[PDB]
């Protein structure tokens, strides 16, 4: 993949404040993208923004949207503020996500559970709905959901996370079918990656023996770039 | 498939008991000897189904109210305590209750309707399953059945919240299926298109006499609550292969 793969492409990334979303941003940016950052923490996004600026020379915008509490109006309002500065979106990476409770179904807490489906499904549904006009105004728009392997096959103790990655996958498949030959619409399964969500989940696992968000990026770029134009409605594993 | 003493002295709770496919499961289970618990949100609809199952079997079911759009974790724990009082287990639970919501472009889906659908179909069904898992554990071969749709396995245009909710349902089932291996049977049914009112809402033009009725598709519904399926778990089954 050439260093100018994403020149003059407008790419928005959620959960840009930390982890995979952080790394996706910086990288899309190094590949020449106009990146847009979303998160819920102004102080964290300022730092990401700052670091990308020191990296590439361009200061990316960040917008605030807490996905737990956000409504359709706020999301629609966020679309408004993005149209102010940008003619279109070429890519939207829905990367934000809440892990919630990792325990037996009998132990799973119902408020954390309703927080998980709020952030991973609803708020992500709502926000997609608002950004679709800007994605359609692009020459080949790319919408990406982040799944997980419990989004394909429920294992014990994954609970609310899992149900919500299943929903992410069907949500992706409805959309891809509706935007056939208008939009690329896909899922990425990152697989286990050196982040603080992964570690919460696996206290004992050694993170240094994991691939970093950096290492898993070839797929993140491929799905935003011209070589995936013909691909839609699929779930790609960053680590097959 | 079966025989009329099959579900003899098995105790089965059916949500969405007051109409469509749950009404029929409840009615059908009871004619095969089951002691049925009817759940729904409409007292009169429920009164009627109970009365009808009485006049058919001579055993009158008990019915309970839970509005899965509005219930809290507490509301469901209470109910389960209520059940635990008259009842010494649950050999079976059919989560039939469902909300269709808007069938329309993802661009057009109402956000509140979207959230209503996930609440009935994923969260309340979650919270309800949770409150009843102890009683189910008390069965010798308890059966937990969810209801999916073919768009819970493969999203298609215009299914919005309901396709999302049914994937989340298959997902949910697989987790539970993983944690209760050799403890519970935990499967899904895909009914197929069935002559009910939810179906009609989605296919207003469809001639409903071209569909199978709830009663045409009951074998599977019956197969899964009895002993012929005892070692099978973690799977989605089609009531209409095709
Ligand atoms: N890391 C891994 O091994 C795997 C991760 N995934 C998925 O990858 C994606 C990224 O996860 P990862 O980078 O690992 O995790 P992190 O927890 O490190 O970061 C997740 C991002 O989501 C944001 N976020 C969480 N809740 C909200 C909210 N309510 N409003 C706005 N933003 C929110 C966080 O913001 P902030 O923290 O700044 O508040 C953060 O920016 C997620 O979809 C995750 O589910 C899938 C498989 C494996
Ligand atoms: N019919 C079909 O072609 C197919 C059906 N299905 C699934 O089969 C199941 C049965 O559907 P079907 O019989 O067709 O539908 P019906 O609409 O005719 O019945 C659905 C049942 O769920 C109950 N319900 C809805 N919302 C709530 C709520 N908030 N609280 C408590 N109960 C509620 C209804 O109660 P009430 O009447 O009292 O309001 C009703 O008893 C559903 O889960 C549906 O998803 C899946 C694929 C195909």
Give domain limits for chain A. Answer: 1-240
Cβ atoms A211, A239 nearer than 8 A = yes
Contacts of B20 (CB under 8 A, 6+ apart): B96, B194, B196, B197, B198, B214
Q: Read off the DSSP letter of residue A151.
A: G
| 3-state secondary structure at position A69 | coil
Cβ atoms A238, A188 nearer than 8 A = yes
Q: Which of A50, A4, A7, A9 minimizes the C-alpha distance to A140?
A: A9
Burial class (CB in 10 A: 0-12, 13-18, 19+), B76: buried
On the CB side of A21, CA atoms within 13 Å amount to 29
Cβ atoms A90, A10 nearer than 8 A = yes
Cβ atoms B131, B233 nearer than 8 A = no
Q: Does B162 touch chain A (CB under 8 A)?
A: no
Cβ atoms A29, A9 nearer than 8 A = no
Helix A19-30 / helix A42-56 crossing angle, nearest 10 deg: 30
Cβ atoms A100, A115 nearer than 8 A = yes
Strand order in the sheet with A141-146: A61-64, A34-39, A10-14, A91-94, A141-146, A183-189, A235-237
Domain B1-242 of CATH type 3.40.50.1100: no
CA of B107 to the centre of ligand 1 (A): 25
Question: Across the strands, what pairs with A185?
Answer: A143
- The torsion defined by the Cα of B52, B53, B54 and B58, in degrees rounded to 10, comes to 140
Instruction: Retrieve residue A66's tokens.
Output: 């807490």
Q: Does B171 touch chain A (CB under 8 A)?
A: yes
Helix B125-137 / helix B160-179 crossing angle, nearest 10 deg: 20
Chain A residues within an 8 Å CB radius of B152: 170
Instruction: Retrieve residue A42's tokens.
Output: 């102004």
Helix A110-117 / helix A159-178 crossing angle, nearest 10 deg: 20
Residue A13, φ and ψ in degrees, nearest 5: -135, 130
Which runs of E-coded beta strand occur in A18-173?
Answer: 34-39, 61-64, 91-94, 141-146
Residue nearest to atom 3 of ligand 2 (CA): B193
Q: How far apart are CA A193 and CA A212, in angstroms?
A: 6
Contacts of B194 (CB under 8 A, 6+ apart): B20, B21, B211, B212, B213, B214, B216, B217, B239
Chain centroid to CA B136: how far?
15
Whether A159 lines ligand 1, by a CB cut-off of 6 Å, is no
Instruction: Retrieve residue B29's tokens.
Output: 């289970």
Resolution for this experimental structure (Å):
2.1
Residue B75 vs residues A66, B67, B124: alpha-carbon distances, Å: 29, 9, 10
CATH topology of domain A1-240: Rossmann fold (3.40.50)
| Partner residue facing B115 (CB), from A122, A160, A162 | A122
Whether B197 lines ligand 2, by a CB cut-off of 6 Å, is yes
Q: How many residues does chain A have?
A: 240
Q: How far apart are CA A52 and CA A32, in angstroms?
A: 11
Q: Does A196 touch chain B (CB under 8 A)?
A: no
Instruction: Retrieve residue B240's tokens.
Output: 């209409």
Q: How far apart are CA B23 and CA B194, in angstroms?
A: 13
Q: Which of A102, A72, A55, A56 minimizes the C-alpha distance to A205?
A: A102
> Any idea which residue has 């059919």 for tokens?
B94
Choice among B29, B32, B87, B162 that is catalytic: B162
| CA angle centred on B85, ends B81 and B87, rounded to 5° | 105
Q: Read off the DSSP letter of residue B158.
A: T
């Amino acid at each position: 993949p050439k260093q100018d793969l994403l020149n003059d492409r407008i790419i928005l990334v959620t959960g840009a404040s930390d982890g995979i979303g952080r790394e996706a941003a910086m990288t899309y940016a190094r590949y020449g993208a106009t990146v847009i950052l979303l998160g819920r923490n102004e102080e964290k996004l300022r730092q990401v923004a700052s670091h990308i600026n020191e990296e590439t020379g361009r200061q990316p915008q960040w917008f605030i949207l807490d996905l737990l509490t956000c409504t359709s109006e706020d999301c629609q309002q966020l679309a408004q503020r993005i149209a102010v500065n940008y003619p279109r979106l070429d890519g939207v990476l829905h990367n934000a996500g809440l892990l919630g409770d990792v325990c037996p179904m009998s132990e799973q807490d119902p408020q954390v559970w309703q927080d998980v489906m709020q952030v991973n499904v609803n708020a992500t549904f709502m926000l997609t709905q608002a950004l679709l006009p800007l994605l359609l105004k692009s020459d080949a728009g790319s919408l990406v959901f982040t799944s997980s392997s419990v989004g394909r096959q429920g294992r014990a103790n994954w609970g609310a996370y899992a149900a919500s990655k299943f929903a992410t996958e069907g949500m992706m498949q409805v959309l891809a079918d509706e935007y056939q030959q208008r939009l690329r619409v896909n899922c990425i399964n990152p697989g286990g990656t050196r982040t603080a969500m992964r570690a919460s989940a696996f206290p004992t696992e050694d993170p240094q023996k994991l691939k970093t968000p950096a290492d898993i990026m070839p797929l993140y770029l491929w799905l935003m770039g011209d070589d995936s134009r013909r691909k839609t409605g699929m779930t790609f594993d960053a680590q097959p």
